[PDB]
Design a protein around this nucleic acid. Structure first.
Ligand SMILES: Cc1cc2nc3c(=O)[nH]c(=O)nc-3n(C[C@H](O)[C@H](O)[C@H](O)COP(=O)(O)OP(=O)(O)OC[C@H]3O[C@@H](n4cnc5c(N)ncnc54)[C@H](O)[C@@H]3O)c2cc1C
Length: 456
DNA sequence: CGGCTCGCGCA
DNA sequence: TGCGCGAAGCCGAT
């Protein structure tokens, strides 16, 4: 649908129709940014061809009640900044509260929209809302993958068993799909308060807040400033100060050598494609660059692959057959310890390294990547059953990670507990052939005592 | 058949 | 710390 720097393979039709006479509406969901946003760029291009303005609509759902203030504030502060950015480009934004299935349909009717565009998420609930909207509108409806460098449905047509099978397919398509972004052109044709939504939601969540004994909150909000501008600064300092040592130190949780981009990536406050462009152009240790690109291209995009092609991505049934057979055989094994959700949540296990990982999670909202593996694997080892382990890990990941409620989290938990995108290892009690990680193993790789002391 | 994102013994 | 091996099941290139 027109454009020159616009690859049509990024866009797909959800519903055909007579293009209406009214504005193009971008139903923003996953990609909460004005810059480097293929969904917003395609929306603007369609609007230009039809000689109509583009408007942005965002629907605040009751979903926020299932997480905490830490995510709600991060997201909403981002959106306050986004509202201003879009304003400068003469793009109005509308913030709706309620079920997207109902509210988006109504908005399209009331505002006499000509075309509807949304960004891409493989999570189940987004597909449900889309199907509801389709039944409620008579205008064309498109979806743009603004989150992946290679559109999810282009990179592969099936569930990929392993990174080693996906890697060649993805890297083959980078020359086509890794490109610079055109600038967002302001609107030429002229056309609820977020402050109030924020106060109302916070009041609702205050009773569920994570607290220490003295009733002082556990969460430290100053580690990550929200919004598009801050995200760019974190990217720049990563490339300048941390990228060089990333390959060597990414698996040492006592060193702050990660990008720290995940909260921003999760809410779409920065484009993965932008990050890849800048890292590609940086002159740094080649090994570090390859390690980083493999994480933000292969592992991030295969997580969308996993959720898109396996709608039971958060269930035991999505595990590979060998892992299901192994875990099933060990269901009756005596566990060395059994903890409840509440005991894991409070960091009251016998294992100080596990407890310190959980304390980093509670206090910062971002557990170091290496201890996330250890953390999830011990939940399998010290729970009543594989289903209960899965349920506990997802519950804590999604409640406390700023970057949670994400394909990466479901794929990472499924790797840790069910061997998805892994292979079988030595046979053990309880965990069977699922890859094992030990306290002693961690001791030989990094200064465990220092991580424990940092987080009590 | 070859090669896949641990623990372990050994410089 | 850095290396090379062991223990495991399967994909996919033929
Ligand atoms: C049990 C478990 C739970 C996880 N929970 C989440 C989660 O809720 N949300 C989430 O986005 N990631 C999650 N991760 C994946 C990974 O730990 C985080 O993306 C990463 O630690 C975020 O830190 P960073 O951006 O500073 O990392 P960097 O090392 O700088 O990583 C760069 C980027 O690469 C991608 N990436 C890196 N590691 C992985 C990985 N294992 N899998 C997928 N993509 C990866 C992410 O987009 C990440 O932000 C989880 C992993 C596991 C094993």
């Amino acid at each position: 649908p027109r454009g020159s720097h616009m690859n049509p393979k990024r866009i797909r039709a959800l519903k055909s129709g007579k293009q209406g006479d009214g504005p193009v509406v971008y139903w923003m969901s996953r990609d909460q940014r004005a810059e480097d946003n293929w969904a917003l760029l395609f929306s603007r291009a369609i609007a230009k061809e039809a000689n109509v303005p583009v408007v942005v609509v965002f629907c605040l759902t009751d979903e926020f009640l299932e997480a905490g203030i830490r995510q709600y504030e991060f997201m909403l502060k981002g959106l306050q900044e986004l509202e201003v950015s879009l304003s400068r480009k003469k793009i109005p934004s509308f913030f709706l509260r309620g079920d997207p299935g109902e509210k988006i349909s109504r908005f399209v009717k009331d505002y006499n929209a000509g075309t509807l565009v949304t960004d891409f998420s493989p999570l189940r609930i987004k597909n449900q809302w889309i199907e509801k909207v389709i039944s409620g509108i008579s205008i064309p409806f498109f979806e743009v993958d603004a989150h992946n460098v290679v559109p999810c449905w282009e990179a592969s047509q099936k569930h990929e068993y392993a990174a080693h099978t996906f890697r060649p397919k993805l890297y083959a398509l980078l020359p086509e799909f890794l490109e610079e972004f055109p600038e967002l052109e302001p609107n030429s044709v002229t056309p609820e308060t977020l402050s109030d939504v924020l106060e109302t939601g916070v009041k609702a969540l205050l009773p569920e807040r994570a607290l220490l004994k003295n009733k002082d909150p556990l969460f430290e909000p100053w580690h990550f400033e929200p919004g598009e501008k801050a995200a760019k600064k974190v990217m720049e300092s990563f490339i300048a100060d941390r990228l060089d040592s990333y390959g060597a130190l990414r698996n040492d949780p006592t060193k702050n050598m990660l990008s720290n981009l995940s909260p921003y990536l999760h809410f779409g406050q920065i484009s993965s494609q932008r990050v890849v462009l800048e890292v590609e152009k940086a002159e740094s240790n080649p090994g570090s660059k390859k390690a980083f690109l493999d994480e933000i291209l292969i592992w991030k995009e295969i997580s969308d692959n996993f959720c898109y092609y396996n709608p039971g991505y958060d269930g035991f049934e999505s595990f590979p057959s060998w892992a299901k057979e192994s875990l099933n055989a060990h269901r009756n094994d005596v566990r060395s310890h059994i903890y409840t959700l509440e005991e894991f949540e409070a960091g009251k296990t016998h294992d100080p390294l596990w407890n310190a990982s959980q304390m980093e999670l509670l206090s910062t909202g971002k557990m170091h990547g290496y201890t996330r593996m250890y953390w999830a694997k011990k939940i399998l080892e010290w729970s009543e059953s594989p289903e209960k382990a899965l349920e506990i890990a997802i519950c804590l990941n999604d409640r406390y990670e700023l970057d949670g409620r994400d394909p990466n989290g479901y794929a990472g938990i499924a790797w840790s507990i069910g061997g998805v995108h892994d292979r079988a290892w030595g046979e053990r009690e309880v965990t069977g052939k699922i890859r094992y990680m030990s306290y002693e193993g961690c001791k030989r790789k990094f200064d465990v005592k220092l991580y424990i002391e940092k987080y009590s």
